[PDB]
Design an enzyme around this catalytic site. Structure first.
Site, PDB file in Angstrom:
ATOM      1  N   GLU A 141      29.884 -14.002  14.470  1.00 58.60           N
ATOM      2  CA  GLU A 141      30.128 -14.587  15.801  1.00 58.60           C
ATOM      3  C   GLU A 141      28.796 -14.956  16.454  1.00 58.60           C
ATOM      4  O   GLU A 141      28.747 -15.940  17.210  1.00 58.60           O
ATOM      5  CB  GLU A 141      30.897 -13.564  16.629  1.00 58.60           C
ATOM      6  CG  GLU A 141      32.210 -13.141  15.987  1.00 58.60           C
ATOM      7  CD  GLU A 141      33.332 -12.824  16.963  1.00 58.60           C
ATOM      8  OE1 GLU A 141      34.004 -13.761  17.414  1.00 58.60           O
ATOM      9  OE2 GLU A 141      33.536 -11.630  17.267  1.00 58.60           O
ATOM     10  N   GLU A 165       0.854  -1.207   0.000  1.00 60.42           N
ATOM     11  CA  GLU A 165       0.000   0.000   0.000  1.00 60.42           C
ATOM     12  C   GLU A 165       0.883   1.248   0.000  1.00 60.42           C
ATOM     13  O   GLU A 165       1.960   1.253   0.622  1.00 60.42           O
ATOM     14  CB  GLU A 165      -0.931   0.028   1.205  1.00 60.42           C
ATOM     15  CG  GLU A 165      -0.226   0.037   2.546  1.00 60.42           C
ATOM     16  CD  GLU A 165      -1.146  -0.348   3.694  1.00 60.42           C
ATOM     17  OE1 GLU A 165      -2.313  -0.683   3.420  1.00 60.42           O
ATOM     18  OE2 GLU A 165      -0.696  -0.317   4.859  1.00 60.42           O
ATOM     19  N   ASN A 206       8.594   1.195  19.139  1.00 60.53           N
ATOM     20  CA  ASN A 206       9.595   1.268  18.057  1.00 60.53           C
ATOM     21  C   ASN A 206      10.891   1.910  18.554  1.00 60.53           C
ATOM     22  O   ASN A 206      11.967   1.509  18.093  1.00 60.53           O
ATOM     23  CB  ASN A 206       9.015   2.042  16.879  1.00 60.53           C
ATOM     24  CG  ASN A 206       7.849   1.326  16.235  1.00 60.53           C
ATOM     25  OD1 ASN A 206       7.557   0.177  16.559  1.00 60.53           O
ATOM     26  ND2 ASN A 206       7.179   2.001  15.317  1.00 60.53           N
ATOM     27  N   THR A 241      -5.157  -8.592  16.914  1.00 60.22           N
ATOM     28  CA  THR A 241      -5.626  -7.496  16.038  1.00 60.22           C
ATOM     29  C   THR A 241      -6.445  -8.007  14.842  1.00 60.22           C
ATOM     30  O   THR A 241      -7.330  -7.278  14.388  1.00 60.22           O
ATOM     31  CB  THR A 241      -4.415  -6.693  15.563  1.00 60.22           C
ATOM     32  OG1 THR A 241      -3.795  -6.082  16.696  1.00 60.22           O
ATOM     33  CG2 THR A 241      -4.794  -5.633  14.559  1.00 60.22           C
TER      34      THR A 241
HETATM   35  N1  GTP Z   1       5.524  -3.111  17.448  1.00 58.98           N
HETATM   36  C1  GTP Z   1       4.844  -2.731  16.356  1.00 58.98           C
HETATM   37  N2  GTP Z   1       3.894  -3.541  15.842  1.00 58.98           N
HETATM   38  C2  GTP Z   1       3.244  -3.106  14.737  1.00 58.98           C
HETATM   39  C3  GTP Z   1       3.495  -1.912  14.136  1.00 58.98           C
HETATM   40  N3  GTP Z   1       2.668  -1.753  13.043  1.00 58.98           N
HETATM   41  C4  GTP Z   1       1.930  -2.847  12.980  1.00 58.98           C
HETATM   42  N4  GTP Z   1       2.246  -3.720  13.995  1.00 58.98           N
HETATM   43  C5  GTP Z   1       1.640  -5.019  14.284  1.00 58.98           C
HETATM   44  O1  GTP Z   1       1.835  -5.914  13.210  1.00 58.98           O
HETATM   45  C6  GTP Z   1       0.585  -6.561  12.876  1.00 58.98           C
HETATM   46  C7  GTP Z   1       0.005  -5.998  11.610  1.00 58.98           C
HETATM   47  O2  GTP Z   1       0.887  -6.253  10.518  1.00 58.98           O
HETATM   48  P1  GTP Z   1       0.952  -5.185   9.321  1.00 58.98           P
HETATM   49  O3  GTP Z   1       2.346  -4.666   9.180  1.00 58.98           O
HETATM   50  O4  GTP Z   1      -0.067  -4.103   9.495  1.00 58.98           O
HETATM   51  O5  GTP Z   1       0.610  -6.077   8.031  1.00 58.98           O
HETATM   52  P2  GTP Z   1       1.038  -5.608   6.560  1.00 58.98           P
HETATM   53  O6  GTP Z   1       2.492  -5.883   6.383  1.00 58.98           O
HETATM   54  O7  GTP Z   1       0.645  -4.176   6.365  1.00 58.98           O
HETATM   55  O8  GTP Z   1       0.160  -6.581   5.629  1.00 58.98           O
HETATM   56  P3  GTP Z   1      -1.153  -6.063   4.834  1.00 58.98           P
HETATM   57  O9  GTP Z   1      -2.199  -5.705   5.849  1.00 58.98           O
HETATM   58  O10 GTP Z   1      -1.638  -7.161   3.935  1.00 58.98           O
HETATM   59  O11 GTP Z   1      -0.756  -4.854   4.034  1.00 58.98           O
HETATM   60  C8  GTP Z   1      -0.322  -6.309  14.069  1.00 58.98           C
HETATM   61  O12 GTP Z   1      -0.099  -7.279  15.071  1.00 58.98           O
HETATM   62  C9  GTP Z   1       0.142  -4.942  14.544  1.00 58.98           C
HETATM   63  O13 GTP Z   1      -0.102  -4.825  15.923  1.00 58.98           O
HETATM   64  C10 GTP Z   1       4.483  -1.061  14.665  1.00 58.98           C
HETATM   65  O14 GTP Z   1       4.770   0.019  14.179  1.00 58.98           O
HETATM   66  N5  GTP Z   1       5.152  -1.518  15.802  1.00 58.98           N
HETATM   67 MG    MG Z   2      -0.670  -3.093   5.103  1.00 57.83          MG
END
Ligand code: GTP
Ligand code: MG
Ligand code: GDP
Ligand code: GDP
Lengths: 430, 442, 49, 269, 150, 430
Positions: free
Chosen positions: B253, B70, B227, B178
C-alpha cells in the site's frame, strides 16, 4: 422467496457481522444457532435468510470473500461468529493493494471460480430464488474489483433475477486512499450496466447523524455499521412478516425506476433521537415523516434541496392507521410541490407491515431517487480528469495489464450518466 | 506476513542492534531467544512471525542478515549480550574494508563475498510462505555500504524480480561531515539506487542531533540515541503488519499510494511525540497537537524544508489510543492551512492507518511513555535540494580529478563518473518537470 | 486448522480480560474518590470539636 | 467525579448513568464479562468441594462401589474432569478430562468401580464370596460419584482415525467422559505390573495398593498420561490418552515406560 | 546494551494495549425502559378477527393500536423447544422423564448399590451459589437404538 | 453365503489389519473374540465372515501370506493380532526382491502349495461358498507375482465362483519403485484373463481426498487404510443386513460387465466431510448424489469428464424413500446425458440397505465402469515401451527364466484392451 447475500472486503465483512446479528436477534436465533423464539410469526419466514440444518439449527445463506484473512478471523472470533458455515469463507494469500486492476484481473480469476461454485450451490439449493444482495465499498481494492467481477458473472448466469447492491463511496471532505477516483470510476461504470438497483452511503453522513442527532461524544465504526444494518434489514421486512399492504423488491423496483439507468437511490431511517431527549417525545406518524424528510437524517452527502425527487418509497413497520400515512404523503407532496418532478402524478409508494423492530413501537425506512446524486459523480469525474491528464500513478494499472481505453470508456459512461440526470432534472411538459 | 531485514556495513549493523533490541522487547523474546509463558491467557500469539521464526524446541531466531567487510563490529555483536539470539551464519564478515572506495566494494572485494550473502538470503526465503518484501539498512557515505549494497540490490532484483525493496539510507549531512570522499560515493550509490529501489527513506544525522537537543534535553548525544529513534520509526511503520487495528496498511500500500512515477520514489520522514519524561506529565498530547507537530520542519529526520516545495502524497500511521473521528478532524484542519501545499494533480493527498498498540518503552531509553504517536512518510519535490548540493560538491572536486586515481586503480573507468553525473542531472530535471503546475489556463 | 483455532481462542480470552480490567479500574477510581470525601468530613468535625 | 461543565457534559452524564443501569440490571447472557467471570469463579469453587472417601477394607483387596482416586506414576497427578469443556459429537456428548494436582478428595477426582456382565470367553469365574473383589482380566466400569451431577458419567474412548485424535499432541487415542455407559466402549481391564508374571496372575484378586496397567478392552490399548501441558480455568493440567509409550520408536512392541502405570489411592488410616 | 535481568522488567517494558468499547445497541435505539423493553409480536389481523362467541375477548381500536404481548400460536416453537430439550440445549429439560426399552445408560448395579446413598444435605450445600451443574442427556444410546432398526 | 479373504504382501497385510478392525467393530466382536453387541441384527449374519470356535469364540476367515516375516510379525504383535488363527500365517525365508519374475517363478512355487492347502481347507469347510476376495498391490513384487499365481490356481480349481480383487496401482506423479511398469504390465495381463472384477485405487487420490475434502494437515497411512476399509466394508454391506432392495456380488457383476474383457472399475464413497463442518449440514439424497458423482470424490487420477459411463452402481444405506433415489438417478442421467453410453437405456443400478455405518444417518458407496480408465493403461504402456526398447533392467527377469516373448505378448494383450475401450467409447447406435 429466498435472498442470497454476498459479503466482500473488510467493510463488507464488518457490516455483515452486525447485519447477521440484527437478523438473528429479530428471529430469535441464539448465537449458538439454535432457534429459541416464542411465536410462530418469527419461525414462519425464517427460510428467507436462513437454511435449516438438522436438529433445530439454522445457518445463514451468505458468502464471505476477502484477499487477506484478518477480517474473517475477526468475524469468526466475534460473539455471533460461530453461526457462519466454515466452508463459506474464501480467501487468498495477498492483498488487493488498493488497485482495481489487481482485484479484477490478476488475483480475481484464481478465486472467482470457487466463489461462483459456492454461489451456484446456494442459488440452486433454493426452491424459488429471489434477487441477490451485495454490500461492498467502491473505494477499496478487493471490494471494487472482485465485487464487480462476481456481479458480472452472476448477471450472466441469472439475468432474470434482481441484483441489488449497498455500496460505500468516498466522502467529499477527507480521503482515506489516494487512488480513490480510479476505483470509484471503474466500479460505477461496471454497476450502471450490470446492476438493477444500487444504494449509496457516505461515512461522513453517518458521522453527522451520530454527532448531530444522537449527540455521541466519541462515535465508532460499530455505531455506523449498526445504523447501516438497521436500514438494510428494514428494506426487506415486508418479504418476511405479515402486513396490511405487502411489498417486494421487484415491486419497489417497478415503482422506483422510471428508466433502467436511473437506479441510484438515497437512504434514510427515521427514529433517531438522543437518550436524554427520548423520554420527552412519543412516536407518531407525523414525527416519523418530519424526521424522514429532514436532510440531516439522510445517509448521503448530497442534499435534496438542490434537486428534485423522481420517485420515493416509504416502508412502515408497526400497527398503525393507513389514513395517517396516506394524508402525510399527500400533505408533503402538496406543500413542497416545486421539489417533485411534475410529469408523474404521484411519486410516493407506501407499504405497511405489522411487526416493528424490537424495542420500537414503529419505524420507517426511506428510499429516494433524487437527481442531486449527480453532484457526487461530477466531483469524482473532475478529480479523475485532474489525475488522468497527468496519467497519475497509471503505471500500476497498466503494469497489471489494463488497456488505457477502459479509463476513457468509464469516464464517458459516467459523463453520460450525469448528463442524463441533469436533462431529466430540467425536463418540462411544453 | 513475513519480512526480511538486510543490514549492510557499520551504520547498518549498529542501527540493527537497536532495531532488534526493540523488536525483542516489544514481542517479549528474552536476549537468549526464549519467551516466558503467560498464565493469564491460555495460548500464545503469532505476532512474532513477521520478524522471528521458532525452532521445534521453541527458541526464536531472527529473519536478518548482517553484512560487513571488516570483522570488528560484527565480532562485537558476536561477543556481546545477544550472542545466543542470532544464528552464526547470519552474521557474515569479510577480512578487510572497502576503505571509503565504492570501487573497492563493488568491483574488487564485494564480488567474492556477494555469493555467500545470496545463498543465505535464498535459504531464508525458502523458509517462508508469505514473504512480502525486503527492508534494507545501509549508509551511502562509506565504501562497502555503497558498493556492496548496490551490487547485492542488483543481484536480488534479477533473482527475485517483483518482490518489494524498501530502503532506509543514511546520506551525507549538509554541513556536518566525516570523510572527504563522501560526495563521490553518494553519487555513485544514488545512480545504482535509482534503477533498483521501490521506496527510499532519507535520514540525516544533523537532523536527529537537532531533534535530540531541541525536544529532549541531551547536550552530548551519541549514535545509540539516533539509532533508538530510527528503531522507533521502523517499528511504527511495520506495526501495521503485526498488531490489531481499525485500518491496516500492507507494505504494498505504501508503494501504491506514495510513488506516482517509477523514478519519483524518494520520501521524507518525521515523528511527532519526541518528548522527555519530565515534560510529558505537564501537557496533554491530543491527536490534533501531534498532527500539527509532524508538519513542522523541527520534527523532520532529514535536513530539508518542505515549505520550498509541494507535497505529492502523505502516509500517516497512528498507533495507540486514537479514534478515527479525531484523525479526520485533524486532517481536515491541516488541509485548511495555507502554508501546506499539494501539487494540483494530486487532490486526494492522504492515506491513513490506525493501530491499537502504543509505543514500547526501553529500559535505558530517553523517550517518555506516551499513549499515542503518529509517523509520516511523504514524497515532496523539496528533496531535490539535497541532490543539487551533493552534485555541486561532486562538481567542485571532479573539476580537478581530486582523488580519481584511487577509483581508476581499483577498477573503474573514468567514463562512469560522467554517466552518473548525467543521470543525477536527469533526476533533477525530473523533479523540476513533475513539480510544475499547469493550474493557469491559456 | 489448529493455528486458526488457537488464534481465535486467544483473541476471545484477551478481549474478555481487557473488558474486566477496564471495569475494575473505573470502580476503584470511584471508591477512592468517596473515601477521600469521607475522611475529609471526619477531619473537619474533629478539629471543630 | 463531575469535572468542569464545558461542552457536552450533560448528555454524557446521562449516557453514563444509563449504561451503568443497563449493566447492573440486565443479564445479557454470555456477552457480559463480569457475570461470566463471576460464574467461572463459582464453577471453580463448586468443583473443588471436599468428599468423604471410604477407608480401606480389612481384607486388603480392591473393592467395587467405593470412592477412589487415580494417580499416574509419571506425572504424580490425579485424574480429573471439567464439565464445561464439552462439545456435541455425532456419537454424543464428549467431556474433556485431564490429570491435575490436588489437596485431597474432591468432586472432580473421586470415582467408583462397577463390574461388567461379560468376560472374555475363557474366564474362570470367581467364587461367590469374592464377588466384590476386583480380579485381573475382569472388565469393569469407572464412574463419577452421584453427587456431581444428575446423569452419571463414564470413562470412554474411540478408535483413532482421520476424525479422532488426542487433545493436545494429536498422536494417540482420545479419552473423555460421557453420559454414555453400559456399552462396549466403556469397559476396562487391569493387568499385572511385572511382565513375565502377567499371565500367571490372571483371574486373581488385586491387592489394595498394587501398581497396574489399565487397558481399553475394545481396542487393547493401555491408558496413559504424558507430560504435555495445557491451560484451563483451574490452571496447568496434563494430557490423558490411550497409547503405548516405549523407549525406542523402532520397536513399538516392547517395554513400557512409567507413564503407562497407575495406582489407586485410599483415605489415610 | 546491557540486557534485561528479571522477567518482571521485561513484562513492564510493554504497556498494555488500549481498548475501545463499542457502544451497546440498546444505547442507540431503545426508547422504552432500558431494563425492561416491551415485547411487540402481534399482527392487526390476528388481533382484530377473534372468536367472540367462543369466549375470547374483543379489542377496541385503541386497544389494537396500543397493546403489548406475544401471539398465542406457538406450536412450532414448542416442537423445536422439545426437540432441543431432547438434544440437550433445552432449558425446560423435557427429557429424562423416562428411558427407552433398549437404550439403557447406567448399569442397574449402580442404581441399587452406590446410587441410593446420596446425601441430600451435602448436595444442597454444594449446589448453593450462582452456578448450577448442567444436565447432559444420553443422546448416544438413543441414537444407537434408532440406528439398529429396519 | 461366506467370503474367504487373502492378504498378500506389505500393502495387503496392512490394509487387511484395518479391514478386520472395522468389521470386528461393526459386529461388536471384542479383540478376544467375545460377542458384546446389543442387537440380534449384528449377530444374525456373523457367519458371512467369521467361523465359530468352541465356547463362544469367533475366528476371522482370512489367510495372511508374505515372503519376509517382518510385516507379519508386526501385525501378529499388534493389538488385534491375537484374533487371527495361528496356522493361517504363511511366510518364507527370502524376499521377493521387488521382482515379478522372481516372485512368480523361483520363490513362488515353494510356498504356493502350502497356500493352496490352506485356501482349499477354508473353501471346502464352507457349507455354501461365495466368491474369493483378494487384496494386493500391482506395483510390488510378491503381491503381483504370487497373487496372480494364486489367482490362476483358484480359477483352475474353482471356475464357477467369483474372483474379486482390490488393487493398488502406481500414482501418476511420484513412483515408489523404479521397475513398476514391468510388474504392472504382467499383472494386468494375468488379471485380464483371470479376474471377474477388479477395483483400482491411486494413493495420490487418497492424499487429495484427505487434504481437499477432510482438510487433514498431516495425513498418515492409517487414514488412507481407513478410507479403503470403509469402502471395502461398504460394498458388501447389503450381503449381510436386511434392506428394501437386496443386492449381491454376482448381481453387481452381471449388471456392470457388458462385454467379457471389460472388468476394471473405479470406486468412491460420499459422506466425506471435515469434523468441524459436519455439525452444519444434514444428510439428504440430493447432497449424497451430487457429491457422489463429483470427480473431486473419485479415487482414480482419470476424470470421468474425459470419458463416458458404460454402467454404474450405487449402494445406499439407511431408511429412505425409493422415490427420491429413483428420481435422483433419472435426473442425473437426463441432465448429463452426453456422459452416458447411448445403447444402454439406463446405466445406473440402485440398491437400498436399512443399516447405516455407526454415527452416520445415511451413506452411499459408488462403483462405476468408465472408459477413462483407458488413459491409465496407455500411460503404463508408454513407460513400459520406453524401458523395454533399451533393455533397461531385463537381465534380472531373463536370469529368473522368462523368455523375451512374454514381454511382447503382455504388451500386445494390453494394447488390445486399450483399443477395445477406444472402440466402445466411440461406438455409435447406427
Ligand atoms: N546514524 C548513524 N550514522 C552512522 C552510524 N555509523 C556510521 N554512521 C555514519 O555513516 C557514515 C560512515 O559510513 P560507514 O558505515 O562507517 O561506512 P562503511 O559501511 O563501514 O564503509 P567502509 O568504511 O569502507 O567499511 C558517516 O557519515 C557516519 O556518521 C550509526 O550507527 N548511526
Ligand atoms: Mg567500515
Ligand atoms: N462505514 C464503514 N466504512 C468502513 C468500514 N471499514 C472500512 N471502511 C471504509 O472503507 C474504505 C476502506 O476499504 P476496505 O474495506 O479496506 O477495502 P479492501 O481493502 O478492498 O477490503 C475506507 O473508506 C474505510 O473508511 C466499516 O466497518 N464501516
Ligand atoms: N495405501 C497404502 N499403500 C501402501 C501401504 N503400504 C505400501 N503401500 C504402497 O504399495 C507399494 C509398495 O508395494 P509393497 O506392498 O511394498 O509390495 P511388496 O514388497 O510385494 O509387499 C507402494 O506404492 C506403497 O506406497 C499401505 O499401508 N497403504
Amino acid at each position: 422467496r429466498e435472498i442470497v447475500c454476498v459479503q466482500a472486503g473488510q467493510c463488507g465483512n464488518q457490516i455483515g457481522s452486525k447485519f447477521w446479528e440484527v437478523i438473528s436477534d429479530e428471529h430469535g436465533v441464539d448465537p449458538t444457532g439454535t432457534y429459541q423464539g416464542d411465536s410462530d410469526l418469527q419461525l414462519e419466514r425464517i427460510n428467507v435468510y436462513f437454511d435449516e440444518a438438522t436438529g433445530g439449527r439454522y445457518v445463514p445463506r451468505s458468502v464471505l470473500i476477502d484477499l487477506e484473512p484478518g477480517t474473517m478471523d475477526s468475524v469468526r472470533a466475534g460473539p455471533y461468529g460461530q453461526i457462519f458455515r466454515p466452508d463459506n469463507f474464501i480467501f487468498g494469500q495477498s492483498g488487493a493493494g488498493n488497485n482495481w486492476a489487481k482485484g479484477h484481473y490478476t488475483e480475481g480469476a484464481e478465486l472467482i471460480d470457487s466463489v461462483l461454485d459456492v454461489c451456484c450451490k446456494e442459488a440452486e439449493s433454493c426452491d424459488c430464488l429471489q434477487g441477490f444482495q451485495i454490500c461492498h465499498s467502491l473505494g477499496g481494492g478487493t471490494g471494487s474489483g472482485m465485487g464487480t467481477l462476481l456481479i458480472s458473472k452472476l448477471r450472466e448466469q441469472y439475468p432474470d433475477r434482481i441484483m441489488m447492491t449497498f455500496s460505500i463511496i468516498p466522502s467529499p471532505k477527507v480521503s482515506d486512499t489516494v487512488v480513490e477516483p480510479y476505483n470509484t470510476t471503474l466500479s460505477v461504470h461496471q454497476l450502471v450496466e450490470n446492476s438493477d438497483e444500487s444504494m449509496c452511503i457516505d461515512n461522513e453522513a453517518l458521522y453527522d447523524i451520530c454527532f448531530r442527532t444522537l449527540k455521541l461524544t466519541t462515535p465508532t465504526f460499530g455505531d455506523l455499521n449498526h445504523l447501516v444494518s438497521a436500514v438494510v434489514s428494514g428494506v426487506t421486512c415486508c418479504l418476511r412478516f405479515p402486513g396490511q399492504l405487502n411489498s417486494d423488491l421487484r415491486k419497489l423496483a417497478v415503482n422506483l425506476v422510471p428508466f433502467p439507468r436511473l437506479h441510484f437511490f438515497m437512504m434514510g431511517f427515521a427514529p433517531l433521537t438522543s437518550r436524554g431527549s427520548q423520554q420527552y417525545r412519543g412516536l407518531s406518524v407525523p414525527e416519523l415523516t418530519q424526521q424522514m424528510f429532514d436532510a440531516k437524517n439522510m445517509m448521503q452527502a448530497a442534499d435534496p434541496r438542490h434537486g428534485r425527487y423522481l420517485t420515493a418509497s416509504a416502508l412502515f413497520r408497526g400497527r398503525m392507521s393507513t389514513k395517517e400515512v396516506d394524508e402525510q404523503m399527500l400533505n408533503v407532496q402538496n406543500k413542497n410541490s416545486s421539489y417533485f418532478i411534475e410529469w408523474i402524478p404521484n411519486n410516493i409508494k407506501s407499504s405497511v407491515c405489522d411487526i416493528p423492530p424490537k424495542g420500537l413501537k414503529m419505524a420507517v425506512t426511506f428510499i429516494g431517487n433524487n437527481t442531486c446524486i449527480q453532484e457526487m459523480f461530477r466531483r469524482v469525474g473532475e478529480q479523475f480528469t485532474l489525475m488522468f491528464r497527468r496519467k497519475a500513478f497509471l503505471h500500476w494499472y497498466t503494469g497489471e495489464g489494463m488497456d488505457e481505453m477502459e479509463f476513457t470508456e468509464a469516464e464517458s459512461n459516467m459523463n453520460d450518466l450525469v448528463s442524463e440526470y441533469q436533462q431529466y432534472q430540467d425536463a418540462t411538459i411544453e | 506476513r513475513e519480512a526480511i531485514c538486510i543490514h549492510i556495513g557499520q551504520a547498518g549493523c549498529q542501527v540493527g542492534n537497536a532495531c532488534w533490541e526493540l523488536f525483542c522487547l516489544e514481542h517479549g523474546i528474552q536476549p537468549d531467544g526464549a519467551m516466558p509463558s503467560d498464565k493469564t491467557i491460555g495460548v500464545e500469539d503469532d505476532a512474532f512471525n513477521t520478524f522471528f521464526s521458532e525452532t521445534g524446541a521453541g527458541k526464536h531466531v531472527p529473519r536478518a542478515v548482517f553484512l560487513d567487510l571488516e570483522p570488528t563490529v560484527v565480532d562485537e555483536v558476536r561477543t556481546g549480550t545477544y550472542r545466543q539470539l542470532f544464528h552464526p551464519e547470519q552474521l557474515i564478515s569479510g577480512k578487510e574494508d572497502a576503505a571509503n572506495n565504492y570501487a573497492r566494494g563493488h568491483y574488487t572485494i564485494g564480488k567474492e563475498i556477494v555469493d555467500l550473502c545470496l545463498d543465505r538470503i535464498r535459504k531464508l526465503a525458502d523458509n517462508c510462505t508469505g514473504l512480502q518484501g525486503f527492508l534494507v539498512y545501509h549508509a551511502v557515505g562509506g565504501g562497502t555500504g555503497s558498493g556492496l549494497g548496490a551490487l547485492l540490490l542488483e543481484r536480488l532484483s534479477v533473482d527475485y524480480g517483483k518482490k518489494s525493496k524498501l530502503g532506509y539510507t543514511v546520506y551525507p549531512s549538509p554541513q556536518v561531515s566525516t570523510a572527504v570522499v563522501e560526495p563521490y560515493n553518494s553519487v555513485l550509490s544514488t545512480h545504482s539506487l535509482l534503477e533498483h529501489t521501490d521506496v527510499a527513506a532519507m535520514l540525516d544525522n544533523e537532523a536527529i542531533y537537532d531533534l535530540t537537543r531541541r525536544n529532549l534535553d541531551i547536550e552530548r548525544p551519541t549514535y545509540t540515541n539516533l539509532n533508538r529513534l530510527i528503531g522507533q520509526v521502523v517499528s511504527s511503520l511495520t506495526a501495521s503488519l503485526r498488531f490489531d487495528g481499525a485500518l491496516n496498511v500492507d507494505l504494498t500500500e505504501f508503494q501504491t499510494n506514495l510513488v506516482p512515477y517509477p523514478r519519483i520514489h524518494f520520501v521524507l520522514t518525521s515523528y511527532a511525540p519526541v518528548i522527555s519524561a519530565e515534560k510529558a506529565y505537564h501537557e496533554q498530547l491530543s491527536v490534533s497537537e501531534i498532527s500539527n507537530a509532524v508538519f513542522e520542519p523541527a520534527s523532520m529526520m532529514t535536513k530539508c524544508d518542505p515549505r520550498h516545495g509541494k507535497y505529492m502524497a502523505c502516509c500517516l500511521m497512528y498507533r495507540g489510543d486514537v479514534v478515527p473521528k479525531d484523525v479526520n478532524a485533524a486532517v481536515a484542519t491541516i488541509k485548511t492551512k495555507r502554508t501546506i501545499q499539494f501539487v494540483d494533480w494530486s487532490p486526494t493527498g492522504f492515506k491513513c492507518g490506525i493501530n491499537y498498540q502504543p509505543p514500547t518503552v526501553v529500559p535505558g531509553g530517553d523517550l517518555a511513555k506516551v499513549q499515542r504517536a503518529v509517523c509520516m512518510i511523504a514524497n515532496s519535490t523539496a528533496i531535490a535540494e539535497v541532490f543539487a548540493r551533493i552534485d555541486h560538491k561532486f562538481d567542485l572536486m571532479y573539476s580537478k580529478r581530486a582523488f580519481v586515481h584511487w577509483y581508476v586503480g581499483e577498477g573503474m573507468e573514468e567514463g562512469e563518473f560522467s554517466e552518473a553525473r548525467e543521470d543525477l542531472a536527469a533526476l533533477e530535471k525530473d523533479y523540476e518537470e513533475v513539480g510544475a503546475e499547469s493550474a493557469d489556463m491559456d | 486448522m489448529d493455528a486458526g483455532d488457537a488464534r481465535v481462542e486467544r483473541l476471545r480470552r484477551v478481549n474478555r480480560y481487557k473488558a474486566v480490567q477496564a471495569e475494575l479500574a473505573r470502580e476503584r477510581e470511584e471508591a477512592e474518590f468517596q473515601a477521600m470525601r469521607e475522611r475529609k468530613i471526619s477531619a473537619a468535625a474533629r478539629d471543630e470539636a | 467525579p463531575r469535572k468542569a461543565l464545558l461542552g457536552n457534559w450533560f448528555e454524557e452524564e446521562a449516557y453514563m448513568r444509563d449504561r451503568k443501569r443497563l449493566l447492573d440490571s440486565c443479564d445479557r447472557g454470555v456477552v457480559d464479562a463480569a457475570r461470566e467471570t463471576q460464574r467461572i469463579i463459582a464453577k471453580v469453587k463448586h468443583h473443588n468441594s471436599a468428599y468423604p472417601m471410604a477407608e480401606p477394607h480389612e481384607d486388603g483387596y480392591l473393592h467395587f462401589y467405593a470412592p477412589l482416586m487415580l494417580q499416574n506414576a509419571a506425572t504424580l497427578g490425579f485424574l480429573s474432569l471439567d464439565l464445561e469443556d464439552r462439545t456435541l459429537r455425532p456419537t454424543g456428548w464428549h467431556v474433556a478430562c485431564s490429570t491435575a494436582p490436588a489437596a485431597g478428595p474432591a468432586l472432580r477426582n473421586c470415582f467408583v468401580l462397577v463390574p461388567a456382565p461379560t468376560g472374555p470367553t475363557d474366564m474362570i469365574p470367581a467364587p461367590p464370596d469374592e464377588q466384590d473383589i476386583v480380579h485381573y482380566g475382569q472388565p469393569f466400569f469407572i464412574m463419577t460419584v452421584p453427587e456431581l451431577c444428575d446423569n452419571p458419567l463414564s470413562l470412554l474412548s474411540e478408535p483413532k482415525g482421520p476424525l479422532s485424535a488426542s487433545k493436545v499432541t494429536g498422536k494417540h487415542q482420545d479419552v473423555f467422559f460421557s453420559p454414555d455407559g453400559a456399552s462396549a466402549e466403556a469397559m476396562w481391564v487391569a493387568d499385572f505390573a511385572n511382565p513375565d508374571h502377567r499371565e500367571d496372575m490372571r483371574d486373581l484378586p488385586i491387592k489394595a495398593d498394587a501398581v497396574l496397567v489399565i487397558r481399553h478392552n475394545h481396542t487393547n490399548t493401555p491408558l496413559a498420561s504424558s507430560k504435555a501441558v495445557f491451560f484451563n480455568d483451574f490452571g496447568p493440567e496434563n494430557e490423558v490418552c490411550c497409547g503405548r509409550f516405549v523407549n525406542n520408536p523402532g520397536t513399538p512392541c516392547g517395554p513400557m515406560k512409567d507413564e503407562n502405570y497407575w495406582t489407586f489411592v485410599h483415605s489415610e488410616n | 546494551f546491557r540486557g534485561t535481568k528479571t522477567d518482571e522488567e521485561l513484562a513492564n517494558a510493554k504497556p498494555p494495549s488500549c481498548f475501545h468499547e463499542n457502544a451497546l445497541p440498546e444505547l442507540l435505539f431503545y426508547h422504552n425502559e432500558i431494563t425492561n423493553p416491551p415485547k411487540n409480536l402481534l399482527t392487526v389481523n390476528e388481533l382484530s378477527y377473534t372468536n367472540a362467541k367462543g369466549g375470547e375477548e374483543v379489542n377496541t381500536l385503541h386497544d389494537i393500536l396500543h397493546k403489548e404481548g406475544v401471539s398465542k400460536k406457538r406450536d412450532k416453537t414448542i416442537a423445536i423447544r422439545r426437540e432441543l430439550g431432547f438434544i440437550g440445549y433445552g432449558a425446560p429439560h423435557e427429557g429424562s422423564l423416562l428411558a427407552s426399552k433398549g437404550a439403557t445408560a447406567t448399569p442397574l448395579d449402580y442404581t441399587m448399590r452406590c446410587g441410593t446413598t446420596t446425601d441430600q444435605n451435602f448436595l444442597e450445600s454444594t449446589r448453593g451459589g450462582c452456578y448450577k451443574p448442567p444436565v447432559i442427556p444420553a443422546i448416544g444410546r438413543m441414537q444407537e437404538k434408532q440406528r439398529l432398526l429396519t
